[PDB]
């Protein structure tokens, strides 16, 4: 069974930074591309960006170009997202998802991580 | 860039009825539409991809149709576990965009 | 950690810095290509050319189907399972392509239900519609010429000429096809064939194929000219003469913590002659590693290098030491020709070999002289702003670096030769010298 | 006598075996090609383009005739019989030119009968014509631009002002002339040869060689193999400057198989030594003939699934150290480091897979357990003795049985020295070796003095 | 000062001597090329294909104008003055091309005054005349096809077919254009682009352009086939979709005291095998200096070599010693194949390897024998007036040289290998031997 | 004058094998291709195969593919044909012939060798 | 593959007369026909190649003609040494095939 | 200012040989092509030939092909023309000229040198 | 190869008058004509190149025109230092050729 495990809830003081991790098991880590998704209190979903661990390439949304940094670690099969200069509107839920092979849809999702700023 | 609009946000239905949910796009997307379901506990599952194809393990109760800029998802004789939120997503042009979402209730 | 100041005295001047991009994550579509036109409206005196054309085309089309059937037989469901004993010999890319073919075979079953409608088309580009959720596009190879030229003139000339014209057109089409779809195609299973080569079955008009499918992006030309749009053959019909093709359309991603540096070579003066340095012109720096790159397979633009595959190459230790500051390890070559670059401009600063070219300052009207112990001259506006090197007048900026650039020397490396026969001659000479040294040292071994 | 078992541990896996065959013994035909169309039925307002076209064509056709006349002048029969040549009047030549001159003299016998129909050649007004003098002799005439004139220009001669038709005809003639200069221009330094292919000759007919070959009546099973290996050739034997046509002879050979010879190919796979990936640098194609091992430049040949087809023998010598490496001495085989992320990592041969499972995911389907490679092994061999089914990423594979030593995975080998294959690195390495040699000799001078 | 007698024994027979010539001093012309046809004659059914075509063309044409605008903005009269700081990075060729562009920009102002007349033309080739002093030529890309085919057939077929035909023709034209005018064109400023590449914007018909321009010379084909006729883009119009091109036409000049010598290789017998000699086939002698030349970039005729640039290359000292009579320094390679030249003819004298070929005299009917201590045989009419080889009979002249040619020996060089993998193996073996020798030298140093 | 000399007659027991030689004189041996022809009772002629000694190539008729083996010896200028597994119907006359340069006709023939099996 | 048929095996003629022999084919061979003569002692000679060309040393008494699938050989005013056997051979497609043979007698 | 300086007048006996020199200043010597012109009695002008010193190339008029030899010297920036086997008709004025870059016109001329043969 | 002819050799003019000098060619030269002036002391200067372009430093008093095979040079209100000799030169084909020359006088 393929599954994704995320870290716990986070509380951040304003103006600081935080890193969120996502771990994968049950398949070959380097054969698939990872995506990050943000859900706010208005229940609308936003796409942040994608990372390809086989070649080491990244693609970003222009809205989050300077806010998020995406990295991978192939030894422990873990993906990291770092968020910078958080304000009060950055409190939300974050998902790590796995992409399909030939069309742009996601088939495996994580549980979600909640981040609050105060 | 491309905007997804779901007009109906809440819908009322009874057990064993037929429900249809519509999704609309501002541009032609060439049948690159997918549907997702979110449970009250917060888990997300894929139901339909490429406008007509069922994901593995999904019951045959769901169906999808549409073309051009108008698409629809149909659920028949709904059970108790079909109370969730439904989203439509387009996969034609970067960046990827999602829909508003529609909530079902008894 | 390139040492630019020491490299400039050797004759290498830094240029433009670019990025590195590679493709991934394609989108798929599928099309039907017919290889025989419809001649129903001129059938009174078509002659007997169509039977010969069909006989000629069947022999070309048979081996491709024969090659596909090998993977068609031995693949089934279990994910996807393959019988390795029945295949015998294969590479990894072939196995991946076979898996892709098995995945793509699902939609061909739905497409093949419209064979009767495919047979009845009489236009160049047709859209066939079964249900609103599935449509297919049909392209016919030679229909436009027949519809525009031969049919309207069917009554003004004797139709033996029309028969000859039709035969000549078919022969020309076959001659064009044979370069791509002949026995040169040994492995049709792979998915590395470009769309430009595939479009030869439609006469080389890939623009129509790409624009009709609805693809549109800002990197269209960059993806097209770097050979990143590919296709694969999945089904061949021998009784109806048509093929089914799947087309892939990827996106570009940027490699992180990596860049490519370019250098400009300028000849310099030593002893009483000219020399030029032999160093790679493009250098890849990834994280903290320096390496080579075969840039002949990649597209070069003004701010990025686009490739369909990683092309990193190892580099020797001596070249790395030369690039990090040791100028005594860098080889050089003599100049015999009369055409060679002799000056360059970098950030408003001029680097010139003023012994071989004529150097003057317009502000003072006085020539600029280079001594016999200097390799190059650096010219900026702290001495005089305006300079003339010929029919061109140039105004200069200020140099950032050491103020004693023109008063410091370096060490020079050993001469080499780069011709093909010279390599063999040098190897022979070195081997003979080594053998003579060993033959002498045998006597010292005896002592 | 290749040692496949030791070669597989280095990363070279055996593949397909093919045959070797070369062409010989042709049969000949001859044809007439015209380079000017007939414009009689549109002659009312052709303008003055034909005179300019003729003047342009004459200056192209003259040097070829000038080059042919040198051999035409100095060849005859000396009764004293074969063919007699005067070596003083020729001066400088090679063997191939002499053989081609002999062939030209042989074809000039049949050129004379064709040159008798000059009046009928100029009167043709079709694209492809067959001319009959008697039942014994036939000839075929092809005209360069007749079809376009007959189909397009003539039927439209009254619907548009013919000042536009003049421009259309001039544009068509100029477009036709643009293509000729790539083949029949000053690049053709030596017209006395028989190595020009039919594809290049067909440029005078617009690139349609299929029409020529199918009209001449040739038919065989290996037509495409002969066509794609550049085995069908032609030779120019006669040029007419007053009527603007040429006479060409076409040769059609057959294929013969070389006995006691075969070609073996190998597949490279990366392997692990201490903490890095390596690839071996060995030729990928080996020719074995009468128990002799050699190289072959396969870039000039055609490769099929059962045989390799060439128009000429392409054997190359091979060094002694490479032969020692191929016979089983793995200590004399070079290797190169891998820096790129794209490289083959496993291969399949006779139902048995060889894989570098350190750098790739490696597990068994039957038991669900992963397959591990230690730091002292270069590769892993997997067959159904360990477990039948294997998973390699997204593919499940069922395996056969290995024929060989049962202790394959428990035995080691010796490795060769590392090398670099870039162009600038060769010069750098040569310079470094020369420096070391010079210092050694400088010390050995003082050693000599003592 | 090549020693031909000693070289002929190795197997290098002298051939033809040629001249050396390079181009200079060109004449200039200016032309206008339109990239969009006129469809006013068939406006009943055109659809919306023209808008899509214009949108596609604008995106292609924009970057070229963007690249030209950099040099257009930083050049002004003062010779001419250039702002070095505003440009930043450049080479000498780009600066020269920019000066040429500024000089050529004078006539474009007069040409641009006829924009209304340019946009109103409806013929393939038009001559526009404002005053008797100045005239210009306009070439339209696709006007002939529309005027000849589509317009006369506008009433015999449905107009949808006409629209499809027009769209197909435009797409084919764009597919042809993209190979030359796409993102491969990184540096449009330079003036090294040939007329053949530029002619793709007119469909590849450069003969029409050169003939209409009025150029006429005896060496037209020689200049055309050596890539000496070039062009440069100077102005692009994004509103009317046309470009202005300048054409250069040079002349050929002969280099003083220089010639090129050719050698013919013939195999020879040493112990029991066939060998060939690895020596450059073309040698350049200039004044008193011997050097190499890369002849793959030049055109070879029967009496001269024509190039657009000097291509001299340095030569090693050992090769120069070998070419002057020291045959102990010339390498050789073994023959394994069955196809190799075995005899040659020079000045009526035959040089043959009679071990591997059959040699006999026609007059006496007796074979000619070569011993095991000879490499080749020289045959002239003092011993055999008429020889027969294979199926050819040849009559011979007299040799001008030593009368004891066949009774004198020579020394031979060392064997070599010329394959890349063999080169790597030889380098590795020599390095290992050198390291072992140095280790033993260290051991002897310890003792 | 160009001429071909053949060996004498042979009597073979059934199941055995024989070799027949053909010698050439008066021309250059490696410049031409050799052919073998069989004539049986009833005077019908059958083509067996050809050999090219310059490159060392062979071509066979499908009827005699497993029956005959063709070889050359360039030192003594000889051609050899070997027959395998003879029966009673292999008793016939055999000819070696020299092929023309450009068309498939034979200009020089040998005297013939008769082979009998009993 | 291609069969050669000579419909006449024996033919009678007198001194000084004209004789014609014929050779038929099942396919078009494009003038690739040759003629051979076998003496009573067992020697074979070539007479005509490529349907109309005389071999060197052959007397001008013999001639050949034909086209398509029908060919003929003609001998005029025959002498005593013209009593032999005559064969026709095709050279268009592998394998090469020979004719049945025709015998002349006085 | 660019200028060209020529040598003085001289008297030649018939059958002798002469050299005439031309010096340049005020510009880059190797960047331009040099031409020689002859004017005889009756004020007719004749073009002799041109030399390109950057590549060392020459071009001659067919009428003067065996009469004149052109030479350059880049060290002192000098051009030389040598005349051979003079007769009485070679008495004339000789002009040294510089050529424009693109079109075949001369922009700078020398003063001229008169040669008399007697 | 190409011959240049100036018909008038001597012309008379007064101060402040308009003068025109003509030059003809035997072939089309495509506007490749240049004009030169020779002073009585022996110096030569360039005036007009490419049939209409003024050389740097030349007064605007001179002008040039023509096409095909006929060309002309016009000088307005000529003054004292305009008494010289005038030559026309073609530059279309090697070898380069000059004209006869025309002399002005008061
Ligand atoms: C392993 O594969 C071989 C195929 O060569 C087969 O004969 C053998 O039975 C297989 N062994 C097992 C245990 O399946
Ligand atoms: C040999 O050749 C030379 C060179 O042409 C000639 O002068 C001489 O007469 C010839 N001698 C004989 C005997 O043919």
PDB file of N, CA, C and O in Angstrom, chain D residues 3-13 269-272 278 280 330 354 373 376-381 402 405 407-415:
ATOM      1  N   UNK D   3      35.347 -14.748 -23.871  1.00  0.00           N
ATOM      2  CA  UNK D   3      35.011 -15.262 -22.543  1.00  0.00           C
ATOM      3  C   UNK D   3      33.846 -14.434 -22.007  1.00  0.00           C
ATOM      4  O   UNK D   3      34.037 -13.402 -21.365  1.00  0.00           O
ATOM      5  N   UNK D   4      32.625 -14.906 -22.270  1.00  0.00           N
ATOM      6  CA  UNK D   4      31.434 -14.118 -21.967  1.00  0.00           C
ATOM      7  C   UNK D   4      31.201 -13.988 -20.466  1.00  0.00           C
ATOM      8  O   UNK D   4      30.707 -12.954 -19.999  1.00  0.00           O
ATOM      9  N   UNK D   5      31.533 -15.029 -19.697  1.00  0.00           N
ATOM     10  CA  UNK D   5      31.272 -15.003 -18.260  1.00  0.00           C
ATOM     11  C   UNK D   5      32.083 -13.919 -17.561  1.00  0.00           C
ATOM     12  O   UNK D   5      31.557 -13.191 -16.713  1.00  0.00           O
ATOM     13  N   UNK D   6      33.367 -13.796 -17.901  1.00  0.00           N
ATOM     14  CA  UNK D   6      34.184 -12.744 -17.307  1.00  0.00           C
ATOM     15  C   UNK D   6      33.794 -11.367 -17.826  1.00  0.00           C
ATOM     16  O   UNK D   6      33.888 -10.381 -17.087  1.00  0.00           O
ATOM     17  N   UNK D   7      33.358 -11.278 -19.084  1.00  0.00           N
ATOM     18  CA  UNK D   7      32.952  -9.993 -19.639  1.00  0.00           C
ATOM     19  C   UNK D   7      31.670  -9.479 -18.999  1.00  0.00           C
ATOM     20  O   UNK D   7      31.487  -8.262 -18.882  1.00  0.00           O
ATOM     21  N   UNK D   8      30.768 -10.379 -18.599  1.00  0.00           N
ATOM     22  CA  UNK D   8      29.504  -9.945 -18.009  1.00  0.00           C
ATOM     23  C   UNK D   8      29.717  -9.280 -16.654  1.00  0.00           C
ATOM     24  O   UNK D   8      28.994  -8.341 -16.299  1.00  0.00           O
ATOM     25  N   UNK D   9      30.700  -9.749 -15.881  1.00  0.00           N
ATOM     26  CA  UNK D   9      30.999  -9.123 -14.598  1.00  0.00           C
ATOM     27  C   UNK D   9      31.559  -7.718 -14.756  1.00  0.00           C
ATOM     28  O   UNK D   9      31.479  -6.922 -13.816  1.00  0.00           O
ATOM     29  N   UNK D  10      32.128  -7.400 -15.919  1.00  0.00           N
ATOM     30  CA  UNK D  10      32.602  -6.048 -16.188  1.00  0.00           C
ATOM     31  C   UNK D  10      31.459  -5.134 -16.616  1.00  0.00           C
ATOM     32  O   UNK D  10      31.498  -3.930 -16.336  1.00  0.00           O
ATOM     33  N   UNK D  11      30.422  -5.673 -17.246  1.00  0.00           N
ATOM     34  CA  UNK D  11      29.277  -4.875 -17.625  1.00  0.00           C
ATOM     35  C   UNK D  11      28.932  -4.987 -19.094  1.00  0.00           C
ATOM     36  O   UNK D  11      28.159  -4.181 -19.618  1.00  0.00           O
ATOM     37  N   UNK D  12      29.496  -5.985 -19.769  1.00  0.00           N
ATOM     38  CA  UNK D  12      29.272  -6.215 -21.192  1.00  0.00           C
ATOM     39  C   UNK D  12      28.447  -7.487 -21.344  1.00  0.00           C
ATOM     40  O   UNK D  12      28.927  -8.582 -21.039  1.00  0.00           O
ATOM     41  N   UNK D  13      27.216  -7.345 -21.825  1.00  0.00           N
ATOM     42  CA  UNK D  13      26.270  -8.451 -21.923  1.00  0.00           C
ATOM     43  C   UNK D  13      26.073  -8.786 -23.395  1.00  0.00           C
ATOM     44  O   UNK D  13      25.842  -7.890 -24.213  1.00  0.00           O
ATOM     45  N   UNK D 269      26.416  -1.997 -19.343  1.00  0.00           N
ATOM     46  CA  UNK D 269      25.683  -1.759 -18.103  1.00  0.00           C
ATOM     47  C   UNK D 269      26.665  -1.206 -17.078  1.00  0.00           C
ATOM     48  O   UNK D 269      27.797  -1.689 -16.968  1.00  0.00           O
ATOM     49  N   UNK D 270      26.244  -0.182 -16.340  1.00  0.00           N
ATOM     50  CA  UNK D 270      27.102   0.410 -15.322  1.00  0.00           C
ATOM     51  C   UNK D 270      27.269  -0.531 -14.131  1.00  0.00           C
ATOM     52  O   UNK D 270      26.410  -1.368 -13.846  1.00  0.00           O
ATOM     53  N   UNK D 271      28.396  -0.387 -13.437  1.00  0.00           N
ATOM     54  CA  UNK D 271      28.722  -1.240 -12.304  1.00  0.00           C
ATOM     55  C   UNK D 271      29.375  -0.409 -11.208  1.00  0.00           C
ATOM     56  O   UNK D 271      29.790   0.731 -11.424  1.00  0.00           O
ATOM     57  N   UNK D 272      29.450  -0.997 -10.017  1.00  0.00           N
ATOM     58  CA  UNK D 272      29.912  -0.321  -8.814  1.00  0.00           C
ATOM     59  C   UNK D 272      31.255  -0.887  -8.376  1.00  0.00           C
ATOM     60  O   UNK D 272      31.444  -2.106  -8.357  1.00  0.00           O
ATOM     61  N   UNK D 278      30.710   3.230 -12.925  1.00  0.00           N
ATOM     62  CA  UNK D 278      31.701   3.152 -13.984  1.00  0.00           C
ATOM     63  C   UNK D 278      31.080   2.503 -15.208  1.00  0.00           C
ATOM     64  O   UNK D 278      30.123   1.735 -15.104  1.00  0.00           O
ATOM     65  N   UNK D 280      32.555   0.551 -18.913  1.00  0.00           N
ATOM     66  CA  UNK D 280      33.713   0.057 -19.640  1.00  0.00           C
ATOM     67  C   UNK D 280      33.719   0.610 -21.059  1.00  0.00           C
ATOM     68  O   UNK D 280      32.665   0.799 -21.671  1.00  0.00           O
ATOM     69  N   UNK D 330      40.777  -9.261 -17.732  1.00  0.00           N
ATOM     70  CA  UNK D 330      40.026  -8.055 -17.402  1.00  0.00           C
ATOM     71  C   UNK D 330      40.885  -6.961 -16.779  1.00  0.00           C
ATOM     72  O   UNK D 330      40.401  -5.836 -16.626  1.00  0.00           O
ATOM     73  N   UNK D 354      20.826  -9.019 -15.570  1.00  0.00           N
ATOM     74  CA  UNK D 354      22.005  -8.510 -14.885  1.00  0.00           C
ATOM     75  C   UNK D 354      21.720  -7.069 -14.487  1.00  0.00           C
ATOM     76  O   UNK D 354      21.399  -6.240 -15.345  1.00  0.00           O
ATOM     77  N   UNK D 373      22.882  -5.875  -2.523  1.00  0.00           N
ATOM     78  CA  UNK D 373      24.210  -6.033  -3.098  1.00  0.00           C
ATOM     79  C   UNK D 373      25.240  -5.475  -2.127  1.00  0.00           C
ATOM     80  O   UNK D 373      25.062  -4.372  -1.599  1.00  0.00           O
ATOM     81  N   UNK D 376      31.466  -5.337  -2.197  1.00  0.00           N
ATOM     82  CA  UNK D 376      32.527  -6.046  -2.896  1.00  0.00           C
ATOM     83  C   UNK D 376      32.058  -6.675  -4.202  1.00  0.00           C
ATOM     84  O   UNK D 376      32.806  -7.447  -4.808  1.00  0.00           O
ATOM     85  N   UNK D 377      30.844  -6.368  -4.648  1.00  0.00           N
ATOM     86  CA  UNK D 377      30.299  -6.913  -5.881  1.00  0.00           C
ATOM     87  C   UNK D 377      30.074  -5.793  -6.887  1.00  0.00           C
ATOM     88  O   UNK D 377      29.706  -4.675  -6.515  1.00  0.00           O
ATOM     89  N   UNK D 378      30.300  -6.100  -8.164  1.00  0.00           N
ATOM     90  CA  UNK D 378      30.094  -5.133  -9.234  1.00  0.00           C
ATOM     91  C   UNK D 378      28.682  -5.191  -9.804  1.00  0.00           C
ATOM     92  O   UNK D 378      28.098  -4.148 -10.114  1.00  0.00           O
ATOM     93  N   UNK D 379      28.123  -6.390  -9.945  1.00  0.00           N
ATOM     94  CA  UNK D 379      26.799  -6.574 -10.519  1.00  0.00           C
ATOM     95  C   UNK D 379      26.109  -7.728  -9.812  1.00  0.00           C
ATOM     96  O   UNK D 379      26.724  -8.470  -9.044  1.00  0.00           O
ATOM     97  N   UNK D 380      24.815  -7.877 -10.089  1.00  0.00           N
ATOM     98  CA  UNK D 380      24.030  -9.008  -9.615  1.00  0.00           C
ATOM     99  C   UNK D 380      23.370  -9.714 -10.790  1.00  0.00           C
ATOM    100  O   UNK D 380      22.835  -9.070 -11.696  1.00  0.00           O
ATOM    101  N   UNK D 381      23.411 -11.042 -10.762  1.00  0.00           N
ATOM    102  CA  UNK D 381      22.724 -11.887 -11.729  1.00  0.00           C
ATOM    103  C   UNK D 381      21.499 -12.491 -11.055  1.00  0.00           C
ATOM    104  O   UNK D 381      21.601 -13.017  -9.943  1.00  0.00           O
ATOM    105  N   UNK D 402      19.858 -19.755 -15.517  1.00  0.00           N
ATOM    106  CA  UNK D 402      21.185 -19.421 -16.012  1.00  0.00           C
ATOM    107  C   UNK D 402      21.992 -20.680 -16.291  1.00  0.00           C
ATOM    108  O   UNK D 402      22.011 -21.613 -15.484  1.00  0.00           O
ATOM    109  N   UNK D 405      28.326 -21.219 -14.323  1.00  0.00           N
ATOM    110  CA  UNK D 405      28.777 -21.529 -12.974  1.00  0.00           C
ATOM    111  C   UNK D 405      27.683 -21.228 -11.959  1.00  0.00           C
ATOM    112  O   UNK D 405      26.972 -20.225 -12.063  1.00  0.00           O
ATOM    113  N   UNK D 407      28.313 -20.629  -8.827  1.00  0.00           N
ATOM    114  CA  UNK D 407      28.890 -19.696  -7.862  1.00  0.00           C
ATOM    115  C   UNK D 407      29.206 -18.348  -8.495  1.00  0.00           C
ATOM    116  O   UNK D 407      30.244 -17.750  -8.203  1.00  0.00           O
ATOM    117  N   UNK D 408      28.331 -17.862  -9.379  1.00  0.00           N
ATOM    118  CA  UNK D 408      28.581 -16.602 -10.075  1.00  0.00           C
ATOM    119  C   UNK D 408      28.682 -15.434  -9.102  1.00  0.00           C
ATOM    120  O   UNK D 408      29.570 -14.585  -9.233  1.00  0.00           O
ATOM    121  N   UNK D 409      27.790 -15.374  -8.116  1.00  0.00           N
ATOM    122  CA  UNK D 409      27.724 -14.223  -7.227  1.00  0.00           C
ATOM    123  C   UNK D 409      28.752 -14.270  -6.103  1.00  0.00           C
ATOM    124  O   UNK D 409      28.822 -13.320  -5.316  1.00  0.00           O
ATOM    125  N   UNK D 410      29.548 -15.332  -6.008  1.00  0.00           N
ATOM    126  CA  UNK D 410      30.524 -15.484  -4.937  1.00  0.00           C
ATOM    127  C   UNK D 410      31.966 -15.360  -5.416  1.00  0.00           C
ATOM    128  O   UNK D 410      32.887 -15.675  -4.655  1.00  0.00           O
ATOM    129  N   UNK D 411      32.190 -14.911  -6.648  1.00  0.00           N
ATOM    130  CA  UNK D 411      33.527 -14.807  -7.215  1.00  0.00           C
ATOM    131  C   UNK D 411      33.776 -13.390  -7.713  1.00  0.00           C
ATOM    132  O   UNK D 411      32.877 -12.750  -8.266  1.00  0.00           O
ATOM    133  N   UNK D 412      35.003 -12.906  -7.517  1.00  0.00           N
ATOM    134  CA  UNK D 412      35.396 -11.578  -7.925  1.00  0.00           C
ATOM    135  C   UNK D 412      36.359 -11.579  -9.104  1.00  0.00           C
ATOM    136  O   UNK D 412      36.786 -12.615  -9.605  1.00  0.00           O
ATOM    137  N   UNK D 413      36.698 -10.366  -9.538  1.00  0.00           N
ATOM    138  CA  UNK D 413      37.564 -10.133 -10.686  1.00  0.00           C
ATOM    139  C   UNK D 413      38.523  -8.994 -10.357  1.00  0.00           C
ATOM    140  O   UNK D 413      38.517  -8.445  -9.252  1.00  0.00           O
ATOM    141  N   UNK D 414      39.357  -8.644 -11.333  1.00  0.00           N
ATOM    142  CA  UNK D 414      40.271  -7.515 -11.248  1.00  0.00           C
ATOM    143  C   UNK D 414      39.863  -6.445 -12.253  1.00  0.00           C
ATOM    144  O   UNK D 414      39.358  -6.749 -13.337  1.00  0.00           O
ATOM    145  N   UNK D 415      40.092  -5.185 -11.888  1.00  0.00           N
ATOM    146  CA  UNK D 415      39.591  -4.045 -12.646  1.00  0.00           C
ATOM    147  C   UNK D 415      40.762  -3.300 -13.276  1.00  0.00           C
ATOM    148  O   UNK D 415      41.891  -3.339 -12.776  1.00  0.00           O
TER     149      UNK D 415
END
